Amino acid sequence: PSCPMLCTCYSSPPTVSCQANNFSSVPLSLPPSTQRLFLQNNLIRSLRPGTFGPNLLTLWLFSNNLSTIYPGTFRHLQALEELDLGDNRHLRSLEPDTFQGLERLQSLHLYRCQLSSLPGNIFRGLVSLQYLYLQENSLLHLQDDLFADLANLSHLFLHGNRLRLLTEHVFRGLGSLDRLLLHGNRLQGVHRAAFHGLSRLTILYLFNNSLASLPGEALADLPALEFLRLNANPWACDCRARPLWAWFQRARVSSSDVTCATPPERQGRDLRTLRDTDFQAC
Ligand SMILES: *[C@@H]1O[C@H](CO)[C@@H](O[C@@H]2O[C@H](CO)[C@@H](O)[C@H](O)[C@H]2NC(C)=O)[C@H](O)[C@H]1NC(C)=O
Ligand SMILES: *[C@@H]1O[C@H](CO)[C@@H](O[C@H]2O[C@H](CO)[C@@H](O)[C@H](O)[C@H]2NC(C)=O)[C@H](O)[C@H]1NC(C)=O
Ligand SMILES: *[C@H]1O[C@H](CO)[C@@H](O)[C@H](O)[C@H]1NC(C)=O
């Protein structure tokens, strides 16, 4: 059985290229030796157990039409290092054990799949994961401990969702994280301890959200921070600004503008142009 129907196969490494055939299902008779499987740009609707072989290292399923990944689909892909399920606009939800088995996975792409929520334990056990792309879904909340096992995660992209709050332990377990992108949500509130333990984080984007203030304790929990983007938020330059203002007095970081939206008498000024005297009556 040497190459799946309408695909092209290569031997070093063992690769099966099945891109752009308008397939409705994953082709049959995948050689067990296959390490790279390229199924992007098809119209595949469902995935089931018994479809993928155990030697896969790379599996690209982006730009398909997936709506259901049945239980057990990925369970025996112990070796898998990269899984891209991005751009499946009707996917919508994932069952809680979808990634069980994938303890060697290093990159997981879930961008643009209409996810509105995730199971709280969906990323459990993904101890190898270094890159997780969840941008441009419709996510409304993230639970505490949603990433708690992801000790090696370096990039977490959550921009372009519908998040309103970051809770106390939403980022617990992310001790290796280097970049956290949360721009283009609707964030209104960040818990004072939401960034606790993010000791290696160097880049934080929070621009284009609905933040009127941010707690001073939270920036202080980012000792490694190098670049912060805070622009396109309705910053309140009243007594609420004092902790962020104070942090910026000491901070050595690159930053965007932090433009006051309110009160009218400070609208348009940068929050760093305020002086100690402006906060004396707080
Ligand atoms: C892409 O997947 C979507 C969602 O499963 C399909 O839209 C469903 O299509 C059937 C028509 O056969 C309807 O019963 C459902 O109302 C549709 N659901 C939604 C949410 O639109 C669509 O047919 C699929 N297209 C291809 C080419 O695979
Ligand atoms: C601010 O962020 C939002 C994402 O919430 C951006 O908005 C919308 O953004 C685009 C249209 O301008 C489209 O790509 C989307 O279909 C639409 N999405 C949502 C969820 O509303 C908006 O562009 C961002 N603004 C800037 C200047 O970056
Ligand atoms: C798949 O490929 C064609 C031709 O390039 C594309 O335009 C078409 O819409 C796709 N097929 C189906 C069945 O929709």
Q: What is the CATH number of the domain that holds 72?
A: 3.80.10.10
**Atom 1 in ligand 1: residue holding the nearest Cα:** 65
- 137 to 37, 134, 159, 184, 214: CA distances (angstroms): 25, 7, 9, 11, 24
Phi, psi of 277 (to 5 degrees): -55, -30
For residue 45, report the distance from its CA to the centre of ligand 1, in Å. 9
Task: At 149, list the tokens.
Answer: 């096992």
**Atom 21 in ligand 1: residue holding the nearest Cα:** 90
Measured distance CA(48)–CA(281) in Å, rounded: 64
Q: What amino acid is encoded at 140 in this protein? A: L
- Please identify, by atom number, the ligand 1 atom nearest to the C-alpha of residue 90: 4
Phi, psi of 235 (to 5 degrees): -60, 130
CA dihedral 232, 118, 54, 76 (to 10 degrees): 160
For residue 113, report the distance from its CA to the centre of ligand 1, in Å. 14
Whether ligand 2 lies within 6 angstroms of the CB of 137 is answered as no
- Domain limits at 192? 1-282
**Atom 3 in ligand 1: residue holding the nearest Cα:** 90
Name every protein residue with a CB atom under 6 angstroms from any ligand 1 atom. 43, 45, 65, 67, 90
Measured distance CA(194)–CA(146) in Å, rounded: 13
CA of residue 26 relative to chain centroid, distance: 27
Q: Are 29 and 53 in contact (CB under 8 A)?
A: no
Whether ligand 2 lies within 6 angstroms of the CB of 160 is answered as yes
* Experimental resolution (Å): 1.8
For residue 60, what are the β-bridge partners? 38, 84
For residue 142, report the distance from its CA to the centre of ligand 3, in Å. 37
- Count of domains observed in the chain: 1
What is the 3 state secondary structure string of the chain?
Answer: CCCCCCCEEEECCEEEECCCCCCCCCCCCCCCCCCEEECCCCCCCEECCCCCCCCCCEEECCCCCCCEECCCCCCCCCCCCEEECCCCCCCCCCCCCCCCCCCCCCEEECCCCCCCCCCCCCCCCCCCCCEEECCCCCCCCCCCCCCCCCCCCCEEECCCCCCCEECCCCCCCCCCCCEEECCCCCCCEECCCCCCCCCCCCEEECCCCCCCCCCHHHHHCCCCCCEEECCCCCEECCHHHHHHHHHHHHCCCEECCCEEEECCCCCCCEHHHCCHHHHCCC
- 215 to 140, 193, 196, 221: CA distances (angstroms): 22, 9, 12, 11
Phi, psi of 246 (to 5 degrees): -65, -40
